[PDB]
């Protein structure tokens, strides 16, 4: 992504919302922005909470969703305007109805403008709507998994990444991350039990993408080997990028 220190940037907390849907996306000294989201098929609903941390009412409180270029087609967001007046210590909510059209990489931008004490306040933060949010976990026996694993022919559909662990390589947290990521977590597939296997279908209006994944941790070297095999090259690429940043 962008170069430079990611503190006070539009994406300080973005990565914390890839494998979970709830939490505080952003908070400065006047406003706290929280999220709660739910997904099903190629659709989702994201609640955005605007908490006024001051004792002063905000005015002309205007949050707007912006989807840059390709995203303008791959994702369709619909939402209702929010009450422009926000009491001190109060919270206003915004429900965003999400429709995934095709697989995507970019993230929508949430721009918030309001008046506080007669001054212009302007905030811009990346919204955590990611491709993996449209997963349907698909449980299956190991023989069925290998059968599908070996049906991949297009080399562009396989994407591998060997990278350095960015966080302690804790077994239980790893499991919770894969599950939160979206695919089914399949033990009993890789003969090596310390490895992790996932399977699921990514759902979009125009195409359903079957996805398989293998994560091989190397505890001594503090590294991981991640392999994505899916029915669409750009999905294998995007999912591999996303998941790799989580470990």
């Amino acid at each position: 992504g962008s170069p430079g220190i990611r503190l006070g940037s539009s994406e300080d907390n973005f990565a914390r919302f890839v494998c979970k849907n709830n939490g505080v996306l952003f908070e400065n000294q006047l406003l706290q922005i929280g999220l709660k989201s739910e997904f099903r098929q190629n659709l989702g609903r994201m609640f955005i909470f605007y908490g006024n941390k001051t004792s002063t009412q905000f005015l002309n409180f205007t949050p707007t969703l912006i989807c840059a270029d390709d995203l303008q087609t791959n994702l369709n967001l619909q939402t209702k305007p929010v009450d422009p007046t926000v009491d001190g210590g109060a919270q206003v909510q915004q429900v965003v109805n999400i429709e995934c059209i095709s697989d995507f990489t970019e993230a929508p931008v949430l721009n918030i403008q309001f008046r506080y004490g007669g001054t212009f306040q302007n905030v811009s933060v990346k919204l955590p709507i990611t491709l993996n949010k449209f997963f349907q976990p698909t449980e299956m026996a190991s023989q069925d998994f290998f059968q599908r694993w070996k049906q991949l022919s297009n080399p562009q559909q396989e994407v591998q990444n060997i990278f350095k662990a960015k966080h302690p390589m804790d077994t239980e947290i790893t499991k919770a991350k894969i599950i939160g990521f979206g695919s089914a977590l399949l033990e009993e597939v890789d003969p090596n039990p310390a490895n992790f296997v996932g399977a699921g279908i990514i759902h979009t209006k125009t195409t359903q993408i079957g996805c398989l994944l293998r994560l091989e941790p190397n505890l001594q070297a503090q590294m991981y080997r991640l392999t994505l095999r899916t029915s669409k090259d750009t999905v294998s690429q995007r999912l591999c990028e996303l998941l790799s940043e989580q470990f």
Binding site: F146, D190, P191, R214
Partner: peptide, 5 residues
């Protein structure tokens, strides 16, 4: 042996 390849 190794079903992975």
């Amino acid at each position: 042996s190794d079903p992975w390849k």
